[PDB]
Write a protein that binds this DNA or RNA. Sequence first.
DNA 1: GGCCGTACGCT
DNA 2: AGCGTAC
DNA 3: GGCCGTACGCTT
DNA 4: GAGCGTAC
Lengths: 481, 482, 190, 189
Amino acid sequence: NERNITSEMRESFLDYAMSVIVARALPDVRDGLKPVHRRILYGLNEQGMTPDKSYKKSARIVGDVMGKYHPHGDSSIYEAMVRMAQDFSYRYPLVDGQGNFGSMDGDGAAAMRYTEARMTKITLELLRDINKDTIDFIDNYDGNEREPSVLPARFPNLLANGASGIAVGMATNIPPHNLTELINGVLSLSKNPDISIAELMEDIEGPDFPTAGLILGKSGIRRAYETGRGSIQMRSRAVIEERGGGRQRIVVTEIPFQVNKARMIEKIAELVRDKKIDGITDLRDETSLRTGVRVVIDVRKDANASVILNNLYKQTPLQTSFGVNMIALVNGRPKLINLKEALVHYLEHQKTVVRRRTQYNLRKAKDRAHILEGLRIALDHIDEIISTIRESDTDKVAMESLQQRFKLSEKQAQAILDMRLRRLTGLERDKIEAEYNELLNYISELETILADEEVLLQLVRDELTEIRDRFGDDRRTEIQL
Amino acid sequence: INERNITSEMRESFLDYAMSVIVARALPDVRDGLKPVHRRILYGLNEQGMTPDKSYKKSARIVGDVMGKYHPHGDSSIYEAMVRMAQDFSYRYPLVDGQGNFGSMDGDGAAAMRYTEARMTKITLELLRDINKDTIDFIDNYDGNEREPSVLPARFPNLLANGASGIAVGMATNIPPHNLTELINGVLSLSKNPDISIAELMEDIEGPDFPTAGLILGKSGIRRAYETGRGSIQMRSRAVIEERGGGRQRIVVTEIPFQVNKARMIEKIAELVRDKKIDGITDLRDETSLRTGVRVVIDVRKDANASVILNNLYKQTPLQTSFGVNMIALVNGRPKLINLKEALVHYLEHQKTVVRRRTQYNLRKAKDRAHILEGLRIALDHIDEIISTIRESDTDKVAMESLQQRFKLSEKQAQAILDMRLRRLTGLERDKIEAEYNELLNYISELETILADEEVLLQLVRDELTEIRDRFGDDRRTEIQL
Amino acid sequence: GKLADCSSKSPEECEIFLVEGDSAGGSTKSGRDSRTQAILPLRGKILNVEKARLDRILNNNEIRQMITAFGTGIGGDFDLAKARYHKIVIMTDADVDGAHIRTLLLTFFYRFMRPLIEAGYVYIAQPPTGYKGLGEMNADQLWETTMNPEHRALLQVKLEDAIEADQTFEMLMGDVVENRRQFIEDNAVY
Amino acid sequence: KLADCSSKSPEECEIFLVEGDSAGGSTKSGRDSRTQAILPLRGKILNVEKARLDRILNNNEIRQMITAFGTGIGGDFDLAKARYHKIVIMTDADVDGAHIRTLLLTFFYRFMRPLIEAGYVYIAQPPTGYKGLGEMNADQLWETTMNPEHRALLQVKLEDAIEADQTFEMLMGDVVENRRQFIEDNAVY
DNA sequence: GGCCGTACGCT
DNA sequence: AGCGTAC
DNA sequence: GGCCGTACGCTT
DNA sequence: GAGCGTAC
Ligand SMILES: C[C@@H]1CN2c3ccc([N+](=O)[O-])cc3CC3(C(=O)NC(=O)NC3=O)[C@H]2[C@H](C)O1
Ligand SMILES: C[C@@H]1CN2c3ccc([N+](=O)[O-])cc3CC3(C(=O)NC(=O)NC3=O)[C@H]2[C@H](C)O1
Ligand SMILES: [Mn+2]
Ligand SMILES: [Mn+2]
Ligand code: NA
């Protein structure tokens, strides 16, 4: 048939626009992940790529993720993953990479066949309990596999590592933070639902970039937290020092977040070359894997090196702003959220995650208990049990007879028929009665949690505090003034 | 200790490389007719459950597994080899089944491996048949973290079937494809006559049989190739002369020579016309299509002798090409120039060994099973005491011991009894054990009979080969003209 | 990257396929009827002309590749009689990215070759729906399901309104995010 | 393309010739920038024992080395202009990496012979094992292979010119048969 | 996703 | 202006 | 193995 | 020739 131009444009564009939006370019407020990042980690999970076990070829990992969950170009997948392994990109890195994974000089990682990976220990905390019905799974694209809609995310990852993503009709820009400060902010909130931003800012000072450096003033920060939008002045950590002979140099040891060191330097070299900046006699990168970042700028003798530096902030990315735009997927729709909203949604998710865990651990402990009761019965009347089976011609017949005589469930009776003879030795019998008693206590432990809303909550608190204590680190970025 | 002699370094360094390329890269094994990259791909396809019944898997996953586990080289060499095996214009008997763009006679490339999928061909299964019955020797993989085979059971003569080409160091190899029907028949004839002449063998095996088909000129090239291992065989396209209207004519080409790129060949023709090297041609057209098949059309000016123009394209273009047969293969881990019969003998002998080893593996296996069944028999008959013995026992070890004492059961027998599930105690189950035991006993005899007579083993090999011929035998594609 | 033309030089019976990606383009060329079907692959997303300036648009290789291929010229210089194919067929993956690429091509035409649509030279192919895209399927099925006239269903593009059509392109592809963002907020069925 | 050390003093400056652009990148970060320069090599390089001068002088790879050494070739070879006093061959611990090593030696021997006699040319000794250079951490490459405190280099020594002249011609030569004989004589299988 | 280097033997 | 997922 | 194309939005 | 086919 025919197709009207106006309606095909409207419809085509929207299918695209909605897709980039809800399934590519924007993170989920609960785990702070985009589709590509989540599937990679879920891929490290299911491929058993834990920190204890050995690295695995990056090509093999990416192939799995693309064959099973992510039907998109392989380059898209690999570079997202590469970024997770970079301690200058992720405030709390999620991939543990072996091989060349790039550097601040904007040099890329080597090709995936040359590199290997596994999780970092903190990734483990993202997926912890993923298999205890804590989160809803979904069909994969071809319907072959199930994948997670979201991760347990037992630390508040959206804010920890931030997110930058350009969608259609919108985009997001969320900066990293200090894990410790975040969790404390979370804990504070759980004790006060009507907590203000101001009071949250007692715990969370501001953004904390993997790259360290300096922030200028609190106002941009302040505005960004109250609205979800604001400008943050990021400066480099630079000092002026004598090189001897009455000559000084400027030395730079930290650079702004998401700034290419190399490119910034060529920007300076270019300004000197074109004479748009007076007073510089030499420029060197002394950065070594041992001595860390160190960029040097020799100042012509008797030149005021402070003034030069000032202009260097004016004319190069030595100072750069970070435009905070905090749009995240909330209930499957794009929303601009202030800081408190960001924490509120994360908290509700940890509530549901631990609740669902505890309920799942229960179902399954009762499921196993029921079985052990079925086995104990058998141990008690083992002679009768045997008689009953031996006198049965068929397993189904034996199933029926066993259910009828000893008043068993079908499950209990199947279990008995599958029981190996060695389970009758002294120790094997003790093991069954020992598992059961331990299990009865567990059940009643679990039932307590679910019987009180506050117990549950405090459990969540403790479980955070623990993560905070193991993983929380020092603030890197200095907030001046 | 800081010092290296340039002469000594060069000799050692070059030899290590040359040796490696020769025995572990560029040359095929005389037995499965595979190079290492190819052997590992098919092993991997097997290790991964990529059988014809199973659905296609993305080629990138396959390559990563092949790379990561067996083959520590560039994924391009890998995927490319795999792609060749899936092209019916490359493989006389393709071993890979590809979904997606795997490329063309013109020779475009396959799509990158993230676009394509694959799995085994039904014929490949026959290379892997019995591989898990200790028929062939496994070895350590490079990182020593895995095991790979040193060769495949290769239940058909694959070296000669698909052939091989490879540039080694100090040597090269060129071996053409053949008709499997004629191939197996050759072997059958060898097996009944350890003294058969090449000439006689050639009663079965006429000559090569290219997937691209086409024609061969004369039997002399083939005979020299088969007697000595080297020789020039002349590969002519299938072209006919036909009328097009107005009393004018055209040459139509429908089968080109093996390993010739159709497009490149066409360019050469075009170039000759442009450069005035040839005369009488007014047009050139590839009308190849999937339905039509390969059709290349050359238009001839009226009153110009086509058959003459034709001869000139044979002389002046790849339209006629030479296959320089140079039959070098790994024999006993060493490169050797073999003739036809030599080829067929190292194959056959492989098969005797493979069938013998399989039979022996089965035997040990069946005898093992029986032993266990005997132990179970005893337990079911004496079950009440057996159960009591275990209940009294405080551990497995205690139970083991007592059972062996009272019933003179073996350690493995008792172990099987302690692992028995209760459901095996139903009345029907006792009958099932008995039936299984009886079949086994018969089975054991059968197997023993084969081991007892080398002739019986040999006939078994003959019978198994013949079934493959009947199932996978097909018609000779290449015509031989004298 | 390189157009593959057909045999026939008579535009009445000629059709040109704008394919998505060079792996799909390669498959298409084998599968096609080379006698009447010319294929031009496009490598990924193409320039959004609505958002770009003239010097850039003219210089861009993809835009240029198609103008040369159609043989009409653009704007005031357009000559529908200079068209080398009476069918220009958009063949993109059955996915959102393919569908994006679609809106981008349609943006170009309606803006630079508007007479070509009104002439109904512009069609949309319709390959198999589902998760597999064009580069993942065989050349024998690309032909039998999308290119082969005997079975294929193409979609001739028509335009009843031009003022509405001008607002749409401007709204959807224009450089004003907000009118786009509002349109998404009004038709968003999450 | 080359990554060069800051120091302009040849005596103390070393250029590593590294196999692959993966290994090259790791090496640039890993190396000590003061004294250590890196020229990566994109795979197998031209065998000059088989090539004529025209081609050799047009080879990108061959051209980059000439330029980087700045000593000139043949009679014009001026060991005095050597921009590095240590020229290091760094390849994988596999047979391909050893092949590459023989490709380089042939060249030095045939065009910068005095460079060897001066003992300027060395062979690195990375971990023998199952990992290529482009798979190792940069920090790992530095300590094992590159840090002069820990590394074990092999200075290449030329004992005898006639013996060296005959061997290069046999091993890298255009005539296959003598190479085939050499293998046949010396293969242990 | 494509274009391109190189070695290696043979014809 | 260039961050980062896509083709 | 390294080049390089495009769309998408944006800091009160 | 230059291109077959595994490698860097
Ligand atoms: C599939 C590719 C083929 N390849 C190519 C390809 C092209 C060129 N070239 O154009 O100079 C050089 C090399 C040499 C090559 C390269 O590009 N880079 C490198 O570092 N090593 C290589 O062998 C090689 C790589 C590893 O694999
Ligand atoms: C990782 C690569 C990136 N890429 C590139 C890369 C470079 C260019 N380019 O320089 O014009 C175009 C495209 C467009 C691109 C391509 O090269 N070919 C293609 O067919 N489609 C694409 O989107 C794309 C491919 C699929 O994936
Ligand atoms: Mn697609
Ligand atoms: Mn290597
Ligand atoms: Na010829």
